[PDB]
Design a protein around this ligand. Structure first.
Ligand SMILES: Clc1ccc(Nc2ccncc2)cc1Cl
Ligand code: NI
Length: 315
């Protein structure tokens, strides 16, 4: 039936937001493992869902070209409010050129690495989508998580539209994931142990915290409160909590610490746990390392990390 648009195919329906490739590189941000809902359907054309709507995105050296598919009606070009949404998603208020410059000034390693990887910024994700996406992320790779999240949305989330062979679903609400046959069905979809944590966390957020409004509270709450709050949930530890804080709760200073960042810290910064003596990853050593990077980079430490992370997936 209807198909995925290119910029050439249907130039009428595309709109644009003025955005240099130095401020945002789609190819580095949408497959960076922040969101797992974007695919490059046709070369340099990124399609994925936002809320209850599909988008396809592509860019030039100075422009971010984008179009919407409402799903239900007259196919038209992105409205103003629809583009405000997109602007916010990419947190484009924030100057990346300034942040790169600031980091480079205090970190000679960053200076050498950031050159080849410009336009790495953080998305502002829906808390719910982010939470459950990052529960599926423990002991896993981007490819597998992408899969799990797609199957999860297909099975539990509302159908929106079909383009080509791909049927786009919205992200499920908590109630949908909280039900009795939720784990069983999720286990069928190959999440394994993670199925328990999904259901449990959905059931928890409803009953223990009073629904999705809780997550919005954490967005306005201070970092430290939000992190402690998140860590109460089944399947959510310091790492996942920091991912969510950073990517969906507007805490730029949150620095998710796993064994991979340990490696980079030790190899590239010569870091060892100083207050600690135990020589390997630990609750306290990880937090120590988080504080280390905040001290060095400042209150957008998580964003700086995102640059290094994106420079590591490319060899
Ligand atoms: Cl800054 C950042 C961005 C994206 C991710 N995504 C992940 C990719 C693979 N396994 C776990 C998480 C993680 C960080 Cl720490
Ligand atoms: Ni050493």
């Amino acid at each position: 039936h209807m198909r995925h648009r290119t910029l050439s195919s249907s130039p009428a329906l595309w709109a644009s937001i003025p955005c240099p490739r130095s401020e945002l590189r789609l190819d580095l941000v949408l497959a960076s493992g922040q969101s797992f809902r974007w695919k490059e359907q046709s070369p340099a054309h990124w399609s994925g869902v936002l809320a209850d709507q599909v988008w396809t995105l592509t860019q030039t050296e100075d422009q971010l070209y984008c179009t919407v598919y409402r799903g239900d009606s007259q196919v038209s070009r992105p409205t103003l409010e629809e583009l405000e949404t997109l602007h916010k998603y990419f947190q484009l208020d924030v100057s990346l050129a300034q942040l790169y410059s600031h980091w480079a000034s205090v970190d000679s390693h960053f200076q050498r690495v950031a050159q080849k990887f410009q336009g790495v910024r953080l998305l502002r994700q829906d808390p719910t989508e982010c939470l459950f996406s990052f529960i599926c992320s423990s002991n896993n790779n981007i490819a597998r998580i992408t899969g799990m999240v797609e199957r999860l949305c297909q099975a539990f989330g509302p159908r929106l539209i079909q383009l080509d062979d791909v049927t786009y679903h919205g992200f499920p609400n908590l109630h949908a994931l909280a039900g009795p046959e939720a784990e069983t069905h999720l286990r069928k979809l190959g999440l394994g142990y993670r199925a328990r944590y999904v259901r449990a966390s959905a059931k928890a957020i409803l009953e223990e915290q009073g629904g999705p409004a809780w997550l919005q509270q954490l967005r306005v709450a201070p970092y430290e409160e939000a992190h402690k709050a998140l860590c109460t949930l089944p399947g959510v530890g310091a790492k996942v909590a920091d991912c969510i804080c950073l990517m969906a709760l507007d805490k730029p200073q949150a620095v998710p610490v796993d064994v991979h960042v340990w490696q980079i810290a030790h190899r590239d910064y010569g870091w060892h746990p100083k207050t600690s003596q135990a020589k390997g990853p630990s609750p306290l050593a990880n937090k120590e390392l988080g504080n280390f990077f905040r001290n060095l980079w400042g209150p957008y430490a998580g964003w700086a990390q995102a640059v290094l992370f994106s420079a590591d997936l490319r060899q």
